[PDB]
Structures are given as C-alpha cells and as structure tokens.
C-alpha cells in the first residue's frame, strides 16, 4: 500500500485533542525570558519590611 505521506489530509485543529497539562513539559528555567523591569509591579509600601535599624 502507498506508504507515503498522503499529502491530501485534514490540516485543521483536531478539536478532540488532549486538553490537559502535559506533565512532561520542560521543568527548567527558560533562560530566554523577559529580563526587563516589569513596569506594572506593586508600588505600595510593603508593610512587612525590616522594622529595625
């Protein structure tokens, strides 16, 4: 039987695909992540800060 790739197939989303967490995903640190300043961060007073000298 034709063992080739069957170029005419269904190129779509396959909606009934496993919609779960993929336990084997890369558990590492992702070095290529946004190293910037996070301009939208908590600008408040941080009440739990060092209350000593």
């Amino acid at each position, epitope marked *: 039987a034709n063992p080739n*790739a069957n*170029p*005419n*197939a*269904n*190129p*779509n*989303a396959n909606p009934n695909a496993n919609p779960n967490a993929n336990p084997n995903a890369n558990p590492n640190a992702n070095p290529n992540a946004n190293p910037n300043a996070n301009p939208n961060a908590n600008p408040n007073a941080n009440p739990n800060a060092n209350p000593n000298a």
Partner: nanobody
Amino acid sequence: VQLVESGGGVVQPGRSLTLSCAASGFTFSNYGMHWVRQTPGKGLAWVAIIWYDGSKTYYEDSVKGRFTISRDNSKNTLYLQMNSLRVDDTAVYYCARVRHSSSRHGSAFDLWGQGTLVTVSS
C-alpha cells in the same frame, strides 16, 4: 469572517517578492490555508499548502524551491515568499481556508480572498 491579502505589484524577472494574507473575524491558528493562482486565459491552479502549524508543507511541482509559504499564527497572517520570479508567474494570487471536516481527508476551500495582482515583466 474576512480574508484580505496585500503585497502585490510589478517586479522584474529574477527578483523576489513577498505576499501577505491577513485573516480577520475567525480563529486563524486552527485552519490550514492555501494559495491559489489565477492566470487570465487559464483556470485556477493550486500553489502551496500550510499545515495549521508550519510543520508540513506541499507545493506545486513547478514552484518547488522558488516559493516558500509560512504562517504567523500570532498575527493572523500568511507569507508566500516568491523567489526567482519568471514571466510565467504573472497571475492573481488568492488565499483559501480549508473547511472543517469530520474525517481525515480534508475538505474544500470555503473562504477565499479578493486576490492581489502580481506582474512579472521587463
């Protein structure tokens, strides 16, 4: 739903041209898209396919190695980068969306664009 291309114009033989195809009104990252020519005096002719991911691709036998199709799901676009254009490639290029099918044999092109005219001459 809407499917509008761009990037047409006139270039000389041997030069390179890149077409774009912006998809609006529907989820673009779920559909495998096509590119179709229409040379005046001839019927439509298929050009390339993109497999919903960029993982798999197929081309017409006469455009292998000169046309490269790739898609950008984050911006809902297609790109058929045409290299080494010839006087043959004078045609109107359409986009096509592959209809959803409850099988594994695909389906027909249900959403077509308005086409961009590409002219190759000197």
